[PDB]
Design a protein around this ligand. Structure first.
Ligand SMILES: Nc1nc2c(ncn2[C@@H]2O[C@H](COP(=O)(O)OP(=O)(O)O)[C@@H](O)[C@H]2O)c(=O)[nH]1
Lengths: 53, 420
């Protein structure tokens, strides 16, 4: 009982690793969202061209 | 499932039906041969699709008018119930003596078209209101089939007399005679005037040669947009009965108005975008309705907006709430949130949005009031009465008819003043 591994010694590692993972996922989601938005805009432009014709 | 037998009759009925089946065939991607390239059509040997519509009249010329036209070969020749005598533009002729002893064949055809279905929902008639054969046979068929099939529902797309100048001189008589048969035996009746259609086609689309074909096309587009939320998928689908229950508060206030959107000219189309605030701004406009009764002179007991295409429902709901809370006067209060919405998921053939507006307003009563004048000014002098009397018509009925009409308009006059 002199030492209990139930305390978190490497809290810094947990924190930094979670930060990096969160940044990675945020980047992926930002990219896919921008892609979706641009696709929606191009579809709207397509309907614009159909109506003009 | 939930089929529709479209009955027509009279000149206006036949023409509007021709253009309406044209538009429907266009929607489902059909060609005049009748092949694809249950709610409306019926399958036939060899993949053919025959419309489920009977066409009736007392004058066999209108047949050759509708049949020879394009998209004409569809209607099965076993349904053209065309008496070979004549109509004459008279109610008692087409309801008691001449256009009445033929109704048995029309009932035969309607029965052979109905008992062959699985779950029939409602009848959908298109006819004039003062035309002799049209109005007469329409109201007689209404009485018969409604006394016969109460499980189903009834819907009639009538055309009212042109308010400013008439098109026939005996139109008030037959209009009142039909009104007295409608409020007792119908369940949904929309009204259209041949007058506001001119103002629209001339001040909304900047047309110069508006042919009756194009006005019928507009009316038929509205009729299709009405029920388009039934035969197609939708985020929130409506029918011919969700309207009949979300609109009429009482068994007689069932005379609606029709509006289609969007309708645009060439330049006006070049300059305006397709965003649902714009469609709403165009929808409620008095100059955009198919009924020559400025709704500004009244309120809306209720109004259903059936959209089409694809759009965020939050936009629809925000537009509804804004137009309702902002025009807080033009809506009656004792029925909170008196405007109903619905969203199907199919745009028209060549657009991105679409809006049909079916409005039970308390403003069309004025139109009836107008008729209540003319008929009254054509009865104390017994004008033209002897033609109707010549077919066994008892003048007594006329009286109650007018009386009935009275109650009708009186009804509306009791509600636009009601407060709570
Ligand atoms: N928009 C439009 N209205 C029509 C047409 N044909 C007839 N109408 C209306 O029909 C009314 C005359 O009554 P009608 O039904 O034609 O007489 P009937 O068919 O001989 O009984 C007129 O008020 C016209 O406005 C049409 O093709 N298009």
């Amino acid at each position: 009982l002199k030492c209990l591994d139930g305390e978190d010694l490497n809290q810094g590692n947990r924190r930094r690793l979670q930060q990096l993972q969160q940044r990675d996922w945020i980047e992926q989601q930002i990219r896919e969202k921008e892609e979706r938005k641009r696709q929606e805009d191009e579809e709207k432009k397509a309907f614009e061209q159909q109506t003009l014709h | 499932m939930r089929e529709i037998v479209h009955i027509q009759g009279g000149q206006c009925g036949n023409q509007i039906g021709a253009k309406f089946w044209e538009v429907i065939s266009d929607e489902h991607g059909i060609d005049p041969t009748g092949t694809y390239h249950n709610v409306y059509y019926n399958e036939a040997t060899g993949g053919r699709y025959v419309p489920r519509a009977i066409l009736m009249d007392l004058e066999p010329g209108t047949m050759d008018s509708v049949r020879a036209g394009p998209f004409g070969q569809l209607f099965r020749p076993d349904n053209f119930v065309f008496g070979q005598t004549g109509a004459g533009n008279n109610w008692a002729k087409g309801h008691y003596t001449e256009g009445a002893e033929l109704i048995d064949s029309v009932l035969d055809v309607v029965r052979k078209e109905a008992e062959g279905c699985d779950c029939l929902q409602g009848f959908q008639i298109t006819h004039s209101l003062g035309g002799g054969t049209g109005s007469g046979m329409g109201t007689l068929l209404i009485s018969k089939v409604r006394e016969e099939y109460p499980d189903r529902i009834m819907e009639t797309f009538s055309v009212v007399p042109s308010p400013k100048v008439s098109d026939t001189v005996v139109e008030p008589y037959n209009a009142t005679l039909s009104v007295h048969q409608l409020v007792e035996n119908a369940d949904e009746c929309m009204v259209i005037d041949n007058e506001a259609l001119y103002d629209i086609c001339f001040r909304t689309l900047k047309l110069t040669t508006p042919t009756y074909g194009d006005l019928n096309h507009l009316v038929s587009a509205a009729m299709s947009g009405v029920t388009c939320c039934l035969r197609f998928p939708g985020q929130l689908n409506s029918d011919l009965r969700k309207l009949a229950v979300n609109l009429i508060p009482f068994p007689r206030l069932h005379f609606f108005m029709i509006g289609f959107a969007p309708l645009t000219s060439r330049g006006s189309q070049q300059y305006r975008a397709l965003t649902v605030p714009e469609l709403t701004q165009q929808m409620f406009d008095a100059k955009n309705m198919m009924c020559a009764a400025d709704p500004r002179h009244g309120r809306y007991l209720t109004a259903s907006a059936l959209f089409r295409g694809r759009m965020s429902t939050k936009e629809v709901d925000e537009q509804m709430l804004n137009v309702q809370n902002k025009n807080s006067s033009y809506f009656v209060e004792w029925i909170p949130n008196n405007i109903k919405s619905s969203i199907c998921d199919i745009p028209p053939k060549g657009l991105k949005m679409a809006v049909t507006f079916v409005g039970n307003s308390t403003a069309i009563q004025e139109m009836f009031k107008r008729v209540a004048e003319q008929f009254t000014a054509m009865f104390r002098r017994k004008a033209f009465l002897h033609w109707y009397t010549g077919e066994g018509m008892d003048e007594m009925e006329f009286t109650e008819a007018e009386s009935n009409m009275n109650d009708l308009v009186s009804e509306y006059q009791q509600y636009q003043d009601a407060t709570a």
